[PDB]
Design a protein around this nucleic acid. Structure first.
Ligand SMILES: [K+]
Ligand SMILES: [K+]
Ligand SMILES: [K+]
Ligand SMILES: [K+]
Ligand SMILES: [K+]
Ligand SMILES: [K+]
Ligand SMILES: [K+]
Ligand SMILES: [K+]
Ligand SMILES: [K+]
Ligand SMILES: [K+]
Ligand SMILES: [Mg+2]
Ligand SMILES: [Mg+2]
Ligand SMILES: [Mg+2]
Ligand SMILES: [Mg+2]
Ligand SMILES: [Mg+2]
Ligand SMILES: [Mg+2]
Ligand SMILES: [Mg+2]
Ligand SMILES: [Mg+2]
Ligand SMILES: [Mg+2]
Ligand SMILES: [Mg+2]
Ligand SMILES: [Mg+2]
Ligand SMILES: [Mg+2]
Ligand SMILES: [Mg+2]
Ligand SMILES: [Mg+2]
Ligand SMILES: [Mg+2]
Ligand SMILES: [Mg+2]
Ligand SMILES: [Mg+2]
Ligand SMILES: [Mg+2]
Ligand SMILES: [Mg+2]
Ligand SMILES: [Mg+2]
Ligand SMILES: [Mg+2]
Ligand SMILES: [Mg+2]
Ligand SMILES: [Mg+2]
Ligand SMILES: [Mg+2]
Ligand SMILES: [Mg+2]
Ligand SMILES: [Mg+2]
Ligand SMILES: [Mg+2]
Ligand SMILES: [Mg+2]
Ligand SMILES: [Mg+2]
Ligand SMILES: [Mg+2]
Ligand SMILES: [Mg+2]
Ligand SMILES: [Mg+2]
Ligand SMILES: [Mg+2]
Ligand SMILES: [Mg+2]
Ligand SMILES: [Mg+2]
Lengths: 97, 101
RNA sequence: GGAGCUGUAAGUAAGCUAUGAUCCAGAGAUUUCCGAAUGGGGGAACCCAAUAUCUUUUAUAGGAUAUUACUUUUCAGUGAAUACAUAGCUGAUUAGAGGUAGACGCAGAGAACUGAAACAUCUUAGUACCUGCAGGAAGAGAAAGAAAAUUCGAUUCCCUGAGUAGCGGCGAGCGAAACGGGAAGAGCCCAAACCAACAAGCUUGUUGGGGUUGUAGGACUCCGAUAUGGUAGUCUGUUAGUAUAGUUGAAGGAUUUGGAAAAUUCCGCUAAAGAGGGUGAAAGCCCCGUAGACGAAAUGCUGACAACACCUAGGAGGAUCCUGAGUACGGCGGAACACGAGAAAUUCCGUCGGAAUCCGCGGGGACCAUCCCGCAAGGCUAAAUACUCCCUAGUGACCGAUAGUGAACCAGUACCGUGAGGGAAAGGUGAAAAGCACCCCGGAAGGGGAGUGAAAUAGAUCCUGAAACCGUGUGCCUACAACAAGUCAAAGCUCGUUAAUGAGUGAUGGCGUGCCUUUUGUAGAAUGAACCGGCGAGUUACGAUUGCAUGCGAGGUUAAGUC
RNA sequence: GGUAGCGGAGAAAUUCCAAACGAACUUGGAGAUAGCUGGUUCUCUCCGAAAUAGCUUUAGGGCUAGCCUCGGAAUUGAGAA
RNA sequence: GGUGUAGUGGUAGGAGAGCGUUCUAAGGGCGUUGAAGGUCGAUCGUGAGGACGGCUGGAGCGCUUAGAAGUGAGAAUGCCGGUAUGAGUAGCGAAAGACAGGUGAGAAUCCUGUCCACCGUAUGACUAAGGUUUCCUGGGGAAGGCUCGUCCGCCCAGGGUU
RNA sequence: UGAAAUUUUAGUACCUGUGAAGAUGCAGGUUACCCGCGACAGGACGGAAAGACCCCAUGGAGCUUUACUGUAGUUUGAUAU
């Protein structure tokens, strides 16, 4: 309250809306997966059992920030293109649940 | 109560310690007892009780019954009490020996 | 149960008691009058009656007992306008009233102060209040559902979702649900189609049978079981336990102090008992008890077990029939849903209009199509949940007499008020009354001795006994002095300490306008305080954020609930 | 005996309605609200202001900045004279 | 721990260190050879405050560490209680009493008596309401009575309403 | 016999001046033995009372109206009975 002066919230405009059908995915940034033994199969079940991902919000999305150093048969809901490149270049294999 | 009228009795505490005596009366609702020769207090008395001088009486005040230890009527050594069903009937019994009362 | 018992409450009398008292527990009897009050009335605790029997009196008068309210339900008899009859009246029956528990929950009706820094929508709030219905819980409740998974399977409550999604003068504020996790777990009936029976007047009211649903169901047409399990029932009983009395329940004696030992010292003992309290002071071993072990004639309660009782069937067809009508729905007006008409689904009330029924109907947040899910308009249903007037057993880093209940004391009292209603103050002798025989002064009260008592400066105003306040005496000073009253220096006088650059007083001199609040600024002629004593004001719950500390670490952590 | 407070009565004055009636008294909501006055209890040490701007149905209130304090941090040491 | 330098007025206010109270858990110790509390002391600490003694008192209380708070009062025209101030002051509530005797510890105040004064369409006699025991007798003077009091509508024990 | 209002403590002079601007209390000077009694009432900005005049409050209450928004009633119509 600014003393009757027009408050900051009131002098500004509302913006946007919310999409009820929004898909918010749980993020795995490619530096985690250096954990797992090469050749194995990464899944949301594996990630949850390890404790990496506790909230599979809408599905796992994989993103490429860190450097990958393994072969991995990774699978998820969606991959980013840089992650596809990095995995397939290391020698893994992308799938989609 | 473990004390009862008609019982020779030893005292445990008080200025009259180690004296003996019998029970003249017992007040269970006070848990007290009266003993001849013990706690003889000096009461300044008025003549309204058929005492035509008023005078000063000497009378036995009560005693608390936890300051009291009964006697074996066959040993003299004072004891504590247990209760036993003899002949179907419940009686007092000595400790330190099986003597009744 | 086993000896003192006649309450508080002394004391006197009279008495009772092993012929088993008082006391305790269960059941039964008596249970005045008022009060729903109910034979009629009435200013509650009073009055007056009627009828039947009995009683008193020579006989009236008088007295005792029983019945006699209204309304509802059924039944019977009489019986008007009005003929049949109905209403009405009367008599038998049947079940209601009224207050509790200043608490909980359903429904009806329904505020404002307040907040929005005004205020009208809105909020407070469907709160308070009032009223009705109640029950030990209620209410809700077995999907015309939640979802989007082709999936969960009756309600309720806790966590979570989440202060999210939304609502909102898009302001203040309001605010879900579902998913998920748990506690608890149960599902059942009826109308209808049709069948059998009765009756009036081929249908149509009553009884019974039948049958309750959505991977549609049932009736109806054919095939066999007579089954098989369950029960949310019964003063059917037995059986066991438990509540309401209770019983038993171990172990210490001496020295010092002292009025008293439980304290001290000495050697011991005991522990399924060292919980607590009392006892002349602080007790494991004195007492009540505790741990532990036994116990209920009688009335309840709880749970099992048998009897009784009630539910409990299977497979094909859908020719045909049925599957909750002034209902769903719609319009208008209003409410509740988190949702303020807004795009407003859903639910409910009033009013008016007004469908189909298995190729059917409703929902999936305007609405249409597709798909999916379910099948209303009839009813019931325990458990988990909320609360405590009360009873028992208890507990407290709760109070300890200006506290804690308003009330530790004969408190909802005294008192105030017409009344509704408000509403106090007031605890403690002593271990034990042993409470002051007797004497003196005095009218007595009250003192003084004596005496009890450990103590009387513990003696009813009673333990301790502060301060204000009122006094008595005494060391120093004080009647030519003005002084927020003190401070500093200091003569003289008088005492002698937590013995150390001592105490008290103070002639005289110097300096010096109280404390608080609020103020630019107060000695203030601005405010407050008569004084003393007590009481009396930044706390807690849930959340947010910052710092400090600890644990762990790109993994840190559980909530509810169970033990 | 009757009229009872969103009221009654009033030969009418804002008058009376149980010793103050422009809306009685009592109980509850209710510890109403109070940007308003009064009060808010022990000690020491370190540091130590403002009474200004702007906006305010705002002007004796409030919000931000300014002025103070505390902790951390870094930066070609900027600060003051 | 020490040496040096520099500084240490302070309201609102911020920060940090503490004293004290009640209770709790633990440890340890002190109390009828006298605890707490009260009171007086010329004592110690920088402050909040802390001891030790003397008298009182008569049964519970300290010390160390840590913790929890109904945790500290001088003011609120604050609340409750007590006692002051004014002050031995205003007031003692319309009016006539005086005397002798008596009772009695005690008399202006009570009783008896004589004069005197007041009321008299009442200051008289009935009585409804209302009060509800105040009526009568016998004792009393703790309190109440605006003084006193031997007295009373006060207190106490009895009775009384046909 | 026995109150009350009031009351920070008080050993409570005067003039002039000062000063929150009008001093018993500060200053300078002057006067004044200590304690009371009866009277008066100039002061203690005396007491009683949180000024009723005034201003303020985004206070209240009552009242008025061609202020706003509503409403009980009154009236008209439609519809149902
Ligand atoms: K206003
Ligand atoms: K139910
Ligand atoms: K004990
Ligand atoms: K709607
Ligand atoms: K001086
Ligand atoms: K924190
Ligand atoms: K940390
Ligand atoms: K205090
Ligand atoms: K004067
Ligand atoms: K107005
Ligand atoms: Mg504006
Ligand atoms: Mg009657
Ligand atoms: Mg408002
Ligand atoms: Mg919720
Ligand atoms: Mg025993
Ligand atoms: Mg004791
Ligand atoms: Mg011993
Ligand atoms: Mg619909
Ligand atoms: Mg409608
Ligand atoms: Mg009390
Ligand atoms: Mg006390
Ligand atoms: Mg001179
Ligand atoms: Mg002189
Ligand atoms: Mg002076
Ligand atoms: Mg003053
Ligand atoms: Mg004053
Ligand atoms: Mg006028
Ligand atoms: Mg309120
Ligand atoms: Mg400083
Ligand atoms: Mg300095
Ligand atoms: Mg104490
Ligand atoms: Mg306090
Ligand atoms: Mg005070
Ligand atoms: Mg005078
Ligand atoms: Mg007079
Ligand atoms: Mg005349
Ligand atoms: Mg008389
Ligand atoms: Mg008198
Ligand atoms: Mg008399
Ligand atoms: Mg002036
Ligand atoms: Mg002047
Ligand atoms: Mg000066
Ligand atoms: Mg005089
Ligand atoms: Mg004045
Ligand atoms: Mg004022």
């Amino acid at each position: 309250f600014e003393g009757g002066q027009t408050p900051l919230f009131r002098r500004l405009p509302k913006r946007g809306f919310t999409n009820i059908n929004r898909k918010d995915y749980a993020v795995v940034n490619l530096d985690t997966l250096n954990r797992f033994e090469d050749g194995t199969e990464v899944t949301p079940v594996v990630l949850k059992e390890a404790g990496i991902v506790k909230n599979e919000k809408a599905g796992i999305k994989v993103l490429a920030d860190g450097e990958l150093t393994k072969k991995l048969t990774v699978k998820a809901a969606k991959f980013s293109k840089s992650a596809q490149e990095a995995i397939e270049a290391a020698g893994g294999s992308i799938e989609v649940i | 109560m473990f004390v009862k009228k008609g019982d020779k009795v030893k005292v445990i505490t008080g200025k009259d310690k180690n004296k003996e005596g019998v029970v003249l009366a017992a007040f269970p609702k006070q848990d007290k007892v009266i003993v001849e020769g013990v706690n003889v207090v000096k009461k300044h008395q008025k003549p309204n009780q058929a005492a035509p001088q008023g005078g000063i009486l000497e009378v036995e005040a009560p005693i608390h019954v936890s300051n009291v230890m009964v006697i074996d009527p066959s040993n003299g050594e004072a004891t504590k009490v247990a209760f036993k069903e003899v002949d179907g009937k419940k009686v007092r019994v000595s400790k330190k020996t099986g003597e009744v009362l």
